Enzyme design. Structure first.
Site, PDB file in Angstrom:
ATOM      1  N   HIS B  41       0.805  -1.215   0.000  1.00 36.23           N
ATOM      2  CA  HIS B  41       0.000   0.000   0.000  1.00 36.23           C
ATOM      3  C   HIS B  41       0.844   1.274   0.000  1.00 36.23           C
ATOM      4  O   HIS B  41       0.276   2.367  -0.007  1.00 36.23           O
ATOM      5  CB  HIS B  41      -1.008  -0.012   1.166  1.00 36.23           C
ATOM      6  CG  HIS B  41      -0.412   0.133   2.539  1.00 36.23           C
ATOM      7  ND1 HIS B  41       0.166   1.302   2.989  1.00 36.23           N
ATOM      8  CD2 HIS B  41      -0.370  -0.729   3.584  1.00 36.23           C
ATOM      9  CE1 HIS B  41       0.564   1.143   4.240  1.00 36.23           C
ATOM     10  NE2 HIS B  41       0.254  -0.081   4.623  1.00 36.23           N
ATOM     11  N   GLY B 143       3.122   6.078  10.110  1.00 38.74           N
ATOM     12  CA  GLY B 143       4.495   5.939   9.684  1.00 38.74           C
ATOM     13  C   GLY B 143       5.160   4.665  10.148  1.00 38.74           C
ATOM     14  O   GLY B 143       6.306   4.406   9.760  1.00 38.74           O
ATOM     15  N   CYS B 145       4.074   1.591   9.460  1.00 37.63           N
ATOM     16  CA  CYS B 145       3.881   0.491   8.522  1.00 37.63           C
ATOM     17  C   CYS B 145       5.211   0.045   7.935  1.00 37.63           C
ATOM     18  O   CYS B 145       6.067   0.863   7.595  1.00 37.63           O
ATOM     19  CB  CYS B 145       2.929   0.894   7.407  1.00 37.63           C
ATOM     20  SG  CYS B 145       1.309   1.330   8.015  1.00 37.63           S
TER      21      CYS B 145
HETATM   22  C1  LIG Z   1      -7.309   6.091   5.714  1.00 36.10           C
HETATM   23  C2  LIG Z   1      -6.975   6.578   7.131  1.00 36.10           C
HETATM   24  C3  LIG Z   1      -6.972   8.108   7.174  1.00 36.10           C
HETATM   25  C4  LIG Z   1      -8.017   6.033   8.111  1.00 36.10           C
HETATM   26  C5  LIG Z   1      -5.588   6.067   7.535  1.00 36.10           C
HETATM   27  C6  LIG Z   1      -4.551   6.072   6.609  1.00 36.10           C
HETATM   28  C7  LIG Z   1      -3.297   5.603   6.976  1.00 36.10           C
HETATM   29  C8  LIG Z   1      -3.080   5.140   8.271  1.00 36.10           C
HETATM   30  N1  LIG Z   1      -1.754   4.662   8.644  1.00 36.10           N
HETATM   31  C9  LIG Z   1      -0.645   5.589   8.709  1.00 36.10           C
HETATM   32  O1  LIG Z   1       0.434   5.197   9.016  1.00 36.10           O
HETATM   33  C10 LIG Z   1      -0.898   7.062   8.399  1.00 36.10           C
HETATM   34  C11 LIG Z   1      -0.330   7.683   7.163  1.00 36.10           C
HETATM   35  N2  LIG Z   1      -0.588   9.087   6.891  1.00 36.10           N
HETATM   36  C12 LIG Z   1      -1.420   9.893   7.825  1.00 36.10           C
HETATM   37  O2  LIG Z   1      -1.632  11.036   7.603  1.00 36.10           O
HETATM   38  N3  LIG Z   1      -1.990   9.279   9.048  1.00 36.10           N
HETATM   39  C13 LIG Z   1      -1.741   7.882   9.333  1.00 36.10           C
HETATM   40  O3  LIG Z   1      -2.195   7.406  10.323  1.00 36.10           O
HETATM   41  C14 LIG Z   1      -1.533   3.259   8.950  1.00 36.10           C
HETATM   42  C15 LIG Z   1      -2.710   2.464   8.375  1.00 36.10           C
HETATM   43  O4  LIG Z   1      -3.585   2.056   9.076  1.00 36.10           O
HETATM   44  N4  LIG Z   1      -2.730   2.246   6.931  1.00 36.10           N
HETATM   45  C16 LIG Z   1      -3.807   1.509   6.275  1.00 36.10           C
HETATM   46  C17 LIG Z   1      -3.309   0.958   4.936  1.00 36.10           C
HETATM   47  C18 LIG Z   1      -4.414   0.308   4.095  1.00 36.10           C
HETATM   48  C19 LIG Z   1      -5.602   1.246   3.916  1.00 36.10           C
HETATM   49  C20 LIG Z   1      -6.125   1.764   5.257  1.00 36.10           C
HETATM   50  C21 LIG Z   1      -5.025   2.416   6.100  1.00 36.10           C
HETATM   51  C22 LIG Z   1      -1.339   3.097  10.473  1.00 36.10           C
HETATM   52  C23 LIG Z   1      -1.695   4.121  11.351  1.00 36.10           C
HETATM   53  C24 LIG Z   1      -1.495   3.924  12.714  1.00 36.10           C
HETATM   54  C25 LIG Z   1      -0.945   2.734  13.152  1.00 36.10           C
HETATM   55  N5  LIG Z   1      -0.610   1.783  12.304  1.00 36.10           N
HETATM   56  C26 LIG Z   1      -0.788   1.938  11.004  1.00 36.10           C
HETATM   57  C27 LIG Z   1      -4.116   5.141   9.197  1.00 36.10           C
HETATM   58  C28 LIG Z   1      -5.369   5.606   8.825  1.00 36.10           C
END
Ligand SMILES: CC(C)(C)c1ccc(N(C(=O)C2C=NC(=O)NC2=O)[C@H](C(=O)NC2CCCCC2)c2cccnc2)cc1
Ligand SMILES: CC(C)(C)c1ccc(N(C(=O)C2C=NC(=O)NC2=O)[C@H](C(=O)NC2CCCCC2)c2cccnc2)cc1
Ligand SMILES: CC(C)(C)c1ccc(N(C(=O)C2C=NC(=O)NC2=O)[C@H](C(=O)NC2CCCCC2)c2cccnc2)cc1
Ligand SMILES: CC(C)(C)c1ccc(N(C(=O)C2C=NC(=O)NC2=O)[C@H](C(=O)NC2CCCCC2)c2cccnc2)cc1
Ligand code: NA
Ligand code: NA
Lengths: 301, 301
Positions: B41, B143, B145
């Protein structure tokens, strides 16, 4: 999100751990530049351990009396001296993996990472707090002496602990890297005990802020208190006094949550009186006191 | 003595963690040999999150759309391919710090160490278990991931988890290093929820044996139980079924302590009925289920 007890990455310190053998005793040493640091009781036979004269024991010792090994490579000992309870062995090789480092003495209530080691080989890593009674609740077995505790601040490794012994209650005592003990302990086989411990009040509050920040809010209330009144509560429950400094240090978390420290204290008062009785905060049924405010900030923002 | 959630030393993995950037998206990758593994992703945009077509998005990428940093060193991507939910970037430099390693897919109840990373830079290390509902209770911010989970048994690092996403309940989902998710989860922003979680019964028993080994016996009783009666009771507390395989696995701890597995199960039944009545086991006021029988022998020896 989530909140977990979390050690610093141990790689910069693993590259420093060696095996030190004197006679039949093998333990761990810390190899920095061209010196290996280890507990001075490495020179002690079992009968020496009951009442050792380290001056005179070390004087009977020589360089060849010490074997130092890094991985499968032996380092040659070209000198030896004693600083307090720590033995310093000069080797003919500067550790090429020596990180930017300093020796630091940590304050009760502050945390550090422990790299548990056996035969110079890193085995596991976990966080510990320096307890108010100057012990740490570690996990150490036969051969773990010489294991070290450390923090990391912008590539600088601050070494703060070397493991020397286990106390009869199963908690652990050691020195800073200049060989000074934390707590009223001696490196001798004699009756020794941890003092009655107390709970690190500012850390419990910091952890309640972490629980709030992570959606755990049931213990909050509309009530606020005073330092004087709460600290009277803290005494009854073997909690450390809360100072203005502690309240200041939590300033960031109070701002982030809208829960003032004295308002969080009111929550803490209520938990101390009733008791957990089985219900949980951040997946614990105890009030956890080994997370500092920094540990919380570094993780909840 | 002492008993602690103990991570493996992270050094062998820190030397493999890199920063992968595609578009405006930055996350972590695992650099082993001349390949960097990272969540696929990394190639989605803000409009690709709900129903990304990963094959279509990847075919439009050139090698130079991928930026890979190791510390402050740029690595050059010379190839790329997708395996399930994992992207595999070939680089012109084999990682000279690559450890002896292997990829393993773990089963629920198994534990591993997580090296939390941000911008390619390791941040902290902690223990996790694969929950029966195929999530993990970690500590991850945006960040993180591409952060990985691993075990280290005799210099061989076995990678078993790469972090992909946070679920609405604050728990975490990811894949093995072949890109197959643990559990029914997909790398889409579509509405997904963890199933109801249960307690890892074999692990709770292992930890009870650990408590005995460290000299605590207050929770034993004179009763025994059949395997089936224990399961009928335990599943009323949302505990996982204990199988004959689990019983077999506890054999060595049963032998070391002299307490038969089903006698320990009788003690667990009682603990569920009674609570702790204000006592603790290995520092905890709840029944801990994230130590495996293997972890117990590891730490207690
Ligand atoms: C779509 C929303 C807005 C809900 C989102 C997007 C990215 C993140 N994630 C980040 O790392 C970010 C990147 N850019 C940002 O601005 N905010 C973030 O949180 C990780 C994650 O869930 N990704 C998946 C990957 C597949 C599709 C769905 C999301 C994450 C965050 C926290 C802990 N573990 C992992 C969290 C939420
Ligand atoms: C300086 C000399 C040349 C004496 C040396 C260098 C490396 C080793 N180390 C090996 O593993 C060997 C490599 N090549 C060999 O030939 N023999 C070895 O033992 C260990 C190592 O680098 N650990 C890393 C550290 C970073 C995180 C992950 C694990 C090591 C290093 C320091 C102390 N203790 C163990 C031994 C000695
Ligand atoms: C009291 C006896 C003599 C039984 C003893 C001696 C050494 C150990 N210790 C070892 O490491 C061993 C070395 N050789 C062995 O054979 N058994 C051991 O346990 C460490 C330790 O307490 N040392 C102090 C050093 C100052 C004086 C008192 C002992 C230790 C053990 C467990 C966890 N942390 C540290 C344990 C017990
Ligand atoms: C192989 C190349 C030459 C590309 C390399 C080598 C070293 C670094 N690393 C530096 O720190 C640098 C050294 N010299 C420089 O010039 N620039 C750097 O970034 C990091 C490092 O060695 N971590 C150790 C790993 C074991 C535990 C303790 C910390 C590093 C290593 C692997 C991935 N990511 C970061 C970066 C790149
Ligand atoms: Na070593
Ligand atoms: Na890196």
């Amino acid at each position: 999100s989530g909140f977990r007890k979390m050690a610093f990455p141990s790689g910069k310190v693993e590259g420093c751990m060696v095996q030190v053998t004197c006679g039949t005793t093998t333990l761990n040493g810390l190899w920095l530049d061209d010196v290996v640091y280890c507990p001075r009781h490495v020179i002690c036979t079992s009968e020496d351990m009951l009442n050792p004269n380290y001056e005179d024991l070390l004087i009977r010792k020589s360089n060849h009396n010490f074997l130092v090994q890094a991985g499968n490579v032996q380092l040659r000992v070209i000198g030896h001296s004693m600083q307090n309870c720590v033995l310093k062995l000069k080797v003919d090789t500067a550790n090429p993996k020596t990180p930017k480092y300093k020796f630091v003495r940590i304050q009760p209530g502050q945390t550090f990472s422990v790299l548990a080691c056996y035969n110079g080989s890193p085995s596991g890593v976990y966080q510990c707090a320096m307890r108010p009674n100057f012990t740490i609740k570690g996990s150490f077995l036969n051969g773990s002496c010489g294991s070290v505790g450390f923090n990391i601040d912008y590539d600088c490794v601050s070494f703060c602990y070397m493991h020397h012994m286990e106390l009869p209650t199963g908690v652990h005592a050691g020195t800073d890297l200049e060989g000074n003990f934390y707590g009223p302990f001696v490196d001798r086989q004699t009756a020794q005990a941890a003092g009655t411990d107390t709970t690190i009040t500012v850390n419990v509050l910091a952890w309640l802020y972490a629980a709030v920040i992570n959606g755990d809010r049931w213990f909050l209330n509309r009530f606020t208190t005073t330092l004087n009144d709460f600290n009277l509560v803290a005494m009854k429950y073997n909690y450390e006094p809360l100072t203005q400094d502690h309240v200041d240090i939590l300033g960031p978390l109070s701002a982030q949550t809208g829960i003032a420290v004295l308002d969080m204290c009111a929550s803490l008062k209520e938990l101390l009186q009733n008791g957990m009785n089985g219900r949980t905060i951040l997946g614990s049924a105890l009030l956890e006191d080994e997370f500092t405010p920094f540990d919380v900030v570094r993780q909840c923002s």
